A paper describes a structure:
Ae. aegypti OBP22 (AeOBP22) is a member of the OBP family of proteins that has been directly implicated in regulating these feeding behaviors. AeOBP22 is unusual in that it is expressed in multiple chemosensory tissues, including in the antenna, the proboscis of the females, the thoracic spiracles, in the male reproductive glands where it is transferred to the females during mating, and in the salivary glands. The monomeric forms of AeOBP22 are similar to other classical OBPs which consist of six α-helices stabilized by three disulfide bridges surrounding a hydrophobic pocket. Our results provide evidence that fatty acids are likely natural ligands for AeOBP22 and that the binding of long-chain fatty acids (C15-C20) is enhanced by a conformational change in the C-terminal tail that is critical to generate a high affinity binding site.
The second crystal form was solved in the P31 space group and contains nine molecules in the asymmetric unit arranged in a pseudo three-fold arrangement of “trimers” consisting of domain swapped dimer and a separately packed monomer. The dimers are identical to those observed in crystal form 1 and superimpose with an average pairwise RMSD of 0.47 Å. The individual monomers superimpose to each other with an average pairwise RMSD of ~0.2 Å. Ligands are observed bound at the center of each monomer with residues 112–121 forming an α-helix that forms one edge of the ligand-binding pocket. No ligand is observed in the dimeric components. In this form we solved the structures with palmitic acid (C16:0), palmitoleic acid (C16:1), and eicosanoic acid (C20) complexes. Saturated C16 binds weakly with KD ~690 nM, however, introduction of a single degree of unsaturation at the Δ9 position (C16:1) leads to an approximate four-fold increase in the binding affinity (KD = 175 ± 41 nM). Dodecanoic acid and palmitoleic acid are strong oviposition attractants in Ae. aegypti, whilst the saturated C14–C16 and C18 acids are attractants at low concentrations but repellents at high concentrations. Therefore, we conclude that the domain swapped dimers are an artifact of the crystallization process, and further discussions below are confined to the structures of the monomeric forms.
Author numbering: 2 to 122
Write the structure that this text describes.
Amino acid sequence: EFTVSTTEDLQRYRTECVSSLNIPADYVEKFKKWEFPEDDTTMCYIKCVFNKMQLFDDTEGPLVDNLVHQLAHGRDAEEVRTEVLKCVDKNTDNNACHWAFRGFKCFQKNNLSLIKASIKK
């Protein structure tokens, strides 16, 4: 049961993660603008959202198949997969928040986005 997350899913997951992690209001407003400071509050927020999107498991780490489904946005699955796998590492400091964010950073660096406009004809 993997389905891709939309904008609406992300807004929901954001609300859930904000409240469950008691995110201060300064951060909330940044996260609504998709602005992510590299600090521990943000790293657990990102883990939390990825968990809910089924992109990240705290034990297994980044979930490649689901990430490929989410991040392809119509692109060649095989090519998106090889890029994703370059972003996948091990839980070196045993901190799943740090682990999720590291993946996030690599994705953004490689221009893989969770959400992308879709044109349909």
